[PDB]
């Protein structure tokens, strides 16, 4: 009964707008069964009108103010063990 | 064979046997000598350039061909009523081409002064493409086929290809064809030419339109035991999901359900023939639709065989979707809207979605009201088709051929292709009949007394002159409807005018006033 | 047995390399091109000779009454063709999967027969007096009914462009409704025993699989 | 050795005016008509029986590395299918030719068998170590795999409209992946000498050209 | 060794905004080879939050507010012979 | 010669913003003939930097800001006859 693996890529990146959107592949989830459920919630960022709460595995951002961003993919299996990573994002 | 005998009789009536329709005709050719019997290549480089899109490199063949692929070289305006009235479809069977009496005449031109005497030595070459290993020229309604009046003398068109291009630059690929190289035959002035092609098993046209549409297919009068989704919410309020389904009958038709859909989309623009509701911009080129393979835009002229417009707006037609003949002395460019005739598809609106509609719509996300740890709340949005490919069990119908449209045009030698009907209208074929590319022969007027290797640049002006004939029967697939309400007909309206429909003018000039399309009786689906 | 996208040998690599990364690692100016081998460890980018059938997606609405949306979306919101300028629901459309395995609950909205069981009443049911039929038996060669059949990219990847810059990140967008394409293999609609058995083909110019 | 888009005669006018203008000139309220013949001197709106064959866009990459975007756009930003529910890379997907004429650098992201040679480790080699197969044979016709097959119009361009005026142009949007439909043709994939001879069609109901 | 001719229609256009979205045609370049690129700039403009640069032969416009605007087409050839002709827009 | 009978439905709706997008659905026009068109009217709304004109059986709406709406739907028949039915679309 193994844990699932949550492998968020890429880790660490470097973006300077008008090009803000941008993705991070979450897919990359190593588990012995299904993984049932992507959460995505990101810890910290600069104060915007929006707040991202996803449950794709693919996560798609979008109008980026400066700053620095630190989010946290959250997996779950069919058993229910989940395994957290976070991921950082850096806007020049 | 001999000066003093005709080496063919004219021959141009048309029998009805009756399930056969052979259709003789006869047009008297002039042949002049293109290109003074060279091989100039051709490209924009020379033409004065053009847009990126237009540029093309071919080489100027000297030799001249015979086109027939318009349906009134063969088809007097008469038999065209007697074959779209009665009659669910036909197909070319065989042909017949007799090249004979050929007089070659020598043109003097001395202190501007024209003095035409024969030749009764100097030969026309002929021969027929009948391995298609040159170049398929004919298929495209290139403006040089046999005269639709009888009496009517035309000059054969020039015959020239086009092969690949990076601009106006040739690449390795590109080939060039020596007509010459082909094995010719000689007539001169008492002989007669003449190949036989038999059609091959080319699907019968479509010569009706559907008297019941393809969404009203169903019975009125009974229920269909699948039921559908009707309601989702009880009623206005907060969180009052529910799910009802109900049956799909006769009140509704909308929901029923259905074996078949209608066929393929591309959407046009829309242009009305009222002028003042069409956007004031230039929008010709510029919101056209257009396929663009190798980089090089090229209008989706006129594209799948779709209808022109919803049943009532007939003053609309789409920007690039429908055959546009010119009516006889009509300008090369740039003529108004009334000098030219439109050919609209209202025939077909049945199984074919309209050319300037977006084909229904498909669900884009998914309607989770209140997900699990993601809430989004997301309506069920639509968005729409503008352009749809072939599914399982799609039927549609192919364009209509028009009196004066295409007759065949050559399946391009490809590793596949789906339904091959040319979009212009007609027949697609494998092995379409032939072209029949016809060249005077160069005559030196008068070498050096001294040797010289050069080509010899100086030949005696010529043409020629003849007769053409071309016999092609079809076959017929007689109607045997048993509908009550009398069928529609094609008429020729009874009311005193000027002149009479496809009849000559006080000049002369014989004018065809209207398109006749092929689709007039009524099968049902 | 054989779901379409696993058709091939889980135990040999495919000698067709697929690009796998296109930048080193996280930084400024740091383009690279990365092949490798696509194998049984990544059958997502196998190299494959047939791809899924047809796709006309149909909108979603679950038995579980309280998920789907509180508005009347029965009508305005369904697949529809619409032949000379009237509509007309695409039920049922063509051969789809009703629901991707495991989503037991969910039909699409006008994508199945819907039969009613003896006693019913003709309109206005309730969803427990009509019996459903759910078409999970071809999900493996054909597209989920309520799924977007895959993506296309829509713009050029072109980082840094010569006098015309605009730094576009390659887009994709979806396929809600996709034509027969090469190649293309799908499966056609069930018969039930409260079914169907024959129709007749429209005496029509041309069509496809009727 | 004939484009698709070149089949036509150079010398010769073709009896279908299409329509040229549709403004007399700039000012207000001066809508018209205005056709013309299509000749030689614009090939681009001659009328054609046939239209290049079926297209599903694929993500450009470029060869020299430094004009793809610095970002790890290889899983997400590819051509992908996805029954039941998992992706799957187009992988090679439908024959389509692999760059414009002029343009040999670029090739799709997952549109052409990429053989490794000899020597080549198993994964994550250089863009050297694998030989990559091009596809400019069949540009003739068969769309470009990186471009997006024409467009299509989206709205009615209605300029006056009685009682619900809304001044709408003539939008045009794209069709990144287009079904077969009615006399289109195409060309399918080639053989190298390191690949593939036969593969077994699926058992199933259904298939198009396999 | 002909230099391009650059082409650009229409020449002048009068709108009037809820349509601001315009396009001058700009494919009309005859040359004898290909043209190898397009390229639009405009000269003058009123103060907008962004400037036009593109390099497609059909421009698109969007968002224009009243004012006048010269545009300029620039085509370069195989060869690099380019000219440059001017378009004139005006907004009600 | 019986008039047509506009038929709007749903009549009565509660929507809360994130979701303001709300179709009522217009094409329940009972009449003999065609319904030669739909006519969509706002009769009251909190002042919008917009104004709801449209003729589509399916009205779109987008960009709701809090209050009360009435909108009113006109069908005209082939012969002429109008029939008027008034909807009210209330947001929380």
Known sequence: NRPPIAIVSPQFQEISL???????????????????????????????????????????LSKLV????????????????????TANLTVN | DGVGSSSGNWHCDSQWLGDRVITTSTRTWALPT???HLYKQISNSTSGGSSNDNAYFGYSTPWGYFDFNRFHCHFSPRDWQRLINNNWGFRPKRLNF???????????????????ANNLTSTVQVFTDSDYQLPYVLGSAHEGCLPPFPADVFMIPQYGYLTLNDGSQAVGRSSFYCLEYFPSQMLRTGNNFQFSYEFENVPFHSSYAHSQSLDRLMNPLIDQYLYYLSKTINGSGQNQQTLKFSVAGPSNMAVQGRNYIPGPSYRQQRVSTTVTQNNN??????????????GRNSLMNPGPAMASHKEGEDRFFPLSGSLIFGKQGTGRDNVDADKVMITNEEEIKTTNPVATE???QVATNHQSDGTLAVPFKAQAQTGWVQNQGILPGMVWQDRDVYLQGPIWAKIPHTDGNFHPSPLMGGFGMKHPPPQILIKNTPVPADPPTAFN?????????????????????????????????????????????????????????????????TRYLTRNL
């Not at chain 2, 031109?109 to 024209?114: I, R, S, T």
């Not at chain 2, 056209?288 to 190798?294: E, G, P, R």
């Not at chain 2, 640049?457 to 017929?476: A, K, P, R």
């Open chain 1, 66 to 85: 400066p700053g620095n961003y630190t989010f946290s993919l959250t997996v779950v299996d069919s058993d229910g063990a989940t395994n957290s990573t």
């Open chain 2, 281 to 294: 911009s230039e929008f010709a080129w510029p919101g056209a639709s257009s396929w663009a393979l190798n």
């Open chain 2, 98 to 116: 007799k090249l004979f009496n050929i007089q070659v005449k020598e043109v003097t031109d001395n202190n501007g002064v024209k003095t035409i």
């Open chain 2, 34 to 36: 293109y290109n003074n």
């Open chain 2, 453 to 517: 290797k050069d080509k010899l640049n100086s030949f005696i002006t010529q043409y020629s002159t003849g007769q053409v004939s071309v016999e092609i029967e079809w076959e017929l697939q007689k109607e045997n409807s048993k509908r009550w309400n009398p069928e529609i007909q094609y008429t020729s309206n009874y009311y005193k005018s000027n002149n009479v429909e496809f009849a000559v003018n006080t000049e002369g000039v014989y004018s065809e006033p209207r398109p006749i399309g």
């Open chain 1, 18 to 60: 008008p090009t803000t959107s941008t993705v991070i592949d979450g897919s990359q989830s190593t588990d012995d069964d299904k993984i049932v459920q992507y959460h995505w919630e990101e810890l910290k960022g600069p104060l915007r009108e929006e707040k991202i709460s996803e449950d794709t595995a693919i996560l798609k």
């Open chain 2, 358 to 360: 977006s084909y229904g």
